[model samples]
Target: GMHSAALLQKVDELPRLPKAIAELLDVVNNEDSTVKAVSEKLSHDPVLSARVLRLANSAEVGTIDDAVVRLGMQTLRTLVIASAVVGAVPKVEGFDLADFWGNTFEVAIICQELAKRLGTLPEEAFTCGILHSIGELLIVNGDPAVAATISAAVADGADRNLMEKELLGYDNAEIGALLAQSWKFTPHLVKGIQFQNHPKSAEPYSKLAGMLAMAKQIAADWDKIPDDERTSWLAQINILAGIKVDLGGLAEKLAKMHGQGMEMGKQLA
Candidate 1:
């Protein structure tokens, strides 16, 4: 459902970005921004330094050559932004931050793989994955009563978007859209988060949104299938998201992606 002004206010009330994250984006935006310069700037914040190191090592952030030597500049920038978003989001008692982020990184890794196969920017896809459920986090932190209602609804297998709208007048996806803007995220990334549940409405960004939608389904359901059926199951999810892949071509890759999810979750956690 579309959000009202109150939803906009709710997004505005969340903590603003730290100076370091703001600068990181600016630094990364420049074509000439070297990894050394970016790395040196981020290393100043000890907490951020450690998280970036962990994410750099995470399988979710893949490398083509020697892992350390080939950490691409774009990948480095995306990690900085993603980690900053995670850091700004405070933990709530009603929600498990580690589990939530762990699962998100799972979705992110899958999205990266999917985007890689689909010939899109895998880093952008990865950023979308990390921020996919941000609206739910903001809701839980801002209004526990509504969060409780959503919990009961989820327990009863109710649709989250509908339940969120009925109780709070805006769904998590919309909240995330608004929140993304406040953080000064690019319009491309913001569109992906805003129209995640309604990918068709995402216009120019629909491909990215669709990739996110499919990857999220994979993250949630991949482990439920027997090992032998995982690849086909992944292709099936891709079809649902409007991505028609050569299943035979991607079968091996899908299995490998599924195999990496668990280990990536641990790394992210």
Candidate 2:
């Protein structure tokens, strides 16, 4: 079921998107929306453009169902601008917001790249990447004291979700997914976020979840992989996503993309 009542109540304290921005996104998602209507709604709203760009820049469509289509290019551009207008993150003691978002965005960018190569919806992958781990943000924002405990456990090499369940009776995935639901993001996107770490639990969105999982792993562990094992690592993720990439070529390309991704992540952060 959903998180127990106490845990769900705590989730209410997490940061959120601006009401106006979230509202505008809902309007754009409407079947009747047109390019003019979408762009008109976004025009001159700089923050909205920026946040929308951050999110829109990361998208695609498939089994993530009703997650929203990539509107026309004009609409797409404006949607990105919409994402740009995100709300403030809740400040947590001892938490470096910059570093936290930087790492998240880095993993997101990698997911985008890998998804593109695999012939999935790169855009959706991008969106998934950007939104995944949002529950971590929620924990830090909603209950920093508890968050600190989780952080300590993580430092000792405990799994974050497991630690969260043991100590807080909830996990970031569920929290993030619930938050997304409240924010009006599509069900597919929510599911992707929910099952990000446990791809098998994703059901219809399993492939997308698996892609995000691999992206998180590669982004975090690529540097630690031995030179000889690097290709295999890349190959495994690629295969997991059902992509047949040339590992030798992918390695070189990813090397370049990784640098660009970090830069892009910085901009979003």
Candidate 3:
């Protein structure tokens, strides 16, 4: 189901945040900001830094070989701001996807490359993927009627799209855009997040959005279970499918992204 433009408009106002959070967003957006500056900003908030380290060091990220993270507040600020700016927006932290986040700081990494795969802008892929589940997050946190129907169906092997329509009157894609707008992300990012669930299909979002879809699907390790509509998505999951790039070659590129996910921790030290 689609979210009515009017209903989406209702949520357009950005949520109120702490003054420091507003400052963090401003600094991260500034071109002069460095990695060290980012680290220090995050360190000022001890609880926030702990959350950043907790996610960074979780066993799901055992591949991150660094034994210790000693980066100054700026480094923490950069990564933590990046992570939170993406994650906290859409209320996306209850489903198995949240578990995925808890164990591995890798989704945002794959999101960055999704742009390359789709031959469109990649800058927003990380953020789009970050907030992809925001609709679910909202439903779980505030929309219980919608949540009970869709989330339960998701757990019971029902397709997410169908469940969303049955209950929430719209799917995550549409709702994500509303959240993105409310959060005041780049207009492109809001568009990309809304359309990213399907790159194979036509829309204003076909190119970049397709890349996001491919990136999100491909970055997963083989152990994860496929969802109900997994097969439908598989066709569009490959970036240069019609081109010469074979799946195996694509897999190598994806593996490199996975490696970078682990390498991020080393930077923490």
Candidate 4:
């Protein structure tokens, strides 16, 4: 009923994927990666692949979930992409972003383009964009009151990072990074989540992150709610590391571009 936050964190950490999964994460983090690539690697250890695949297809069945047909790269990508998508499904587990999940998809579309511009894996880039700011999910998942306060604060025209620092002792990005680590995600993925908000802190991570950050801003600007809801992002589009694409134009073409990318990605996967 009452447990120390540290204990909660510790228990969560222990239940995280084991060393073998960590090993798989490292391989997937590489630039030369794909659902097929990851599947090939996971296939090396039948037990690992089987177990991971079983976990992947579990969405279709019940708790018993014998559901083990074949564990391949696309299947692996499915698991990764599923988690990435799940992170954006606001109103989920009290980590509600129900009002903004559509914008989240737009951000993913923009970020995939941004990451490709910055020379990272486009698919992973999309996955990363989908997942950045996921700390918002964790914070709400752990403490809904804090999440509501953040919501109200941002609604009141407060800077999210500043308000989070003051009231929650950490912002959504930090919370997301913590959860990413606890989830036993890849270092690059975790770093991307942590630094998406801090352009400078992104470093090598920043190259790709800058593009994503810009895309997120572009989406915000496009949404254009009101003075109280405007973001500083639109004003900072130049931060996108040696890039000068028209975010507005890109957003307009997002549907066509994402359609092509998804089709290509599916074929390749």
Candidate 5:
């Protein structure tokens, strides 16, 4: 029931990943790939090279090779994916790309931190964080009117997944997962997006999905949480209990990550 013909059609018509970025994904996914190899491949794409350089210089490094070393393979992979996805999606009239991407980066950053603490693959968590809401972009691109309606309803405090399902018979998370699958993302990554809001629904109970769900929730509420109340507030998110993080100073850490995320978001967006 979630797989509507129209939604599939829209996803099919979305822009293909640039050949260079697709190849880069392959390189990063390979355990044998070296920093030099990745740097060489990244230099081939002028746009991506420039973007990587900019991100690198932020860390006080110059040149592609140095960038690769400083950013590390995982962070570099995330930059390529984030840059490619941001570049591929065409601007829609009503969508706020800056705000959308800013929130996306925050979620990704939170996912990375949480993954590190939970002993899961932080890069996978970060990648999932970047892609979790991508179906929203697809919907906005393919059907702006309906997207606007959903947006308005969400603005009025309606649950987004509920509104999307009621109006379009599917949610953005499902659509995003399908798109990630088509892009040849690993099955684990795809499921993380698919079951982000409802982690228990995943076939093997994806930890990445649970991580994404937690990250998204934290990103959404970060600004509203007062410092003194932060610990108690975090305690109430049922999912966090299962994950079992050290909430001590977590709110402060998240605040720092949030700033870094916004800076990176500006670079990529």
Candidate 6:
């Protein structure tokens, strides 16, 4: 009854990462790779190099080497992967690509900040946030009619995962997890995406999943929540305690991150 096979096939058919981006990802993934090496590889791609430089200049740096040092290796890796994934995904006719990426960047920034508070690696959290909804793109591309139905149902306030499961026998998160796995992402990353909506269900209780959940909520409600109520508003989410994030000054931090996300979305999208 599940559409698992069809969904898996769709994931398989998704375009491979471009060769240069794939090579850059390999260099970043290597433990022995140096900042100079990353900078050199980045210099070969004018567009990517310029983007990294732009991000660096935004952070008060000047060159790619400076960008690498200022941003850190993990963050540079996240930026590369985020750029690659966003560039690789085929645009679906009815999907709002700009809006989708805007929300994604917002979630990523929130997750990165939340990860710091949770005493975890911010880059991994940020990457999870960026890729969390990739399955939605896969679904839309794989089955536009069903995707439209799910989208409409969600607009009507129906539970999105529940509706997706009823119609497709699985949800976007699961598909995203599968895609991440196929891409040879770390096991934790796959698990993070797999249990994003219900992090506690993960066998080892993935903190990244919990981070993604919280970040997703913050992104969705960023505009709706009043600035004064942001802190109290976050305190109400039970997952904050589940992940053991301290509530002190987080709301203000998140607001700043939201602004960064907006700028990043504009730059990348």
- Model 1: per-residue lDDT, tens digit, 91-204? 777666767787887788878877887788888888888888888888887788888888898899999888988887888888887887777777777778877776756545
CA lDDT, every model vs. true structure: 0.73, 0.64, 0.53, 0.53, 0.76, 0.77
Model 1 clash pairs are: none
lDDT ranking, high to low: 6, 5, 1, 2, 4, 3
Colliding residue pairs in candidate 5: none
Looking at model 6, residue 63 earns an lDDT score of: 65
User: Residue 51 of model 4: what lDDT?
Assistant: 37
lDDT of 4: 0.53
Give the lowest summed-lDDT range of ten residues in model 6. Answer: 1-10
Taking the candidates one at a time, how many backbone clashes does each contain?
A: 0, 23, 15, 6, 0, 0
Error of 3 at 81 (Å): 3.2
Q: Encode model 6's per-residue lDDT on 1-269: one tens digit a residue.
A: 11467455555576577778778877876768887887788888877766655544433766667767777777776777777677777777776776788788788888888888888888888888888999888878777899899889889999988888888777889988888877667888888888888877776788888888888888887789888988777876634525667889898777666667666766763
Q: What's model 6's lDDT at 235?
A: 74
> Relative to the unseen true structure, what is the C-alpha lDDT of residue 140 in candidate 5, on a scale of 0 to 100?
80
Pitting candidate 2 against candidate 5, the one with the higher lDDT is 5
Model 5, 1-269: lDDT tens digits are 23677466556576687787778878877768888887788778888777766655543766667666777767776677777777766776766787788788788889888888778888888888888888888778766788889889999999988888888777888889888888778888987888888876666677878888888888788778876687677767534524566677777787666667667766763
Give, for candidate 1, the lowest lDDT window spanning 10 residues.
Answer: 60-69
Q: Tens digits of per-residue lDDT for model 4 on 58-164?
A: 33422112222344343345344433334223355643243344455456667767655546666666666656766666566666787688789899898987776
Q: Which RMSD does model 6 reach against the true structure?
A: 2.6
lDDT over C-alpha atoms for residue 52 of model 6 = 58
lDDT of 6 at 138: 82
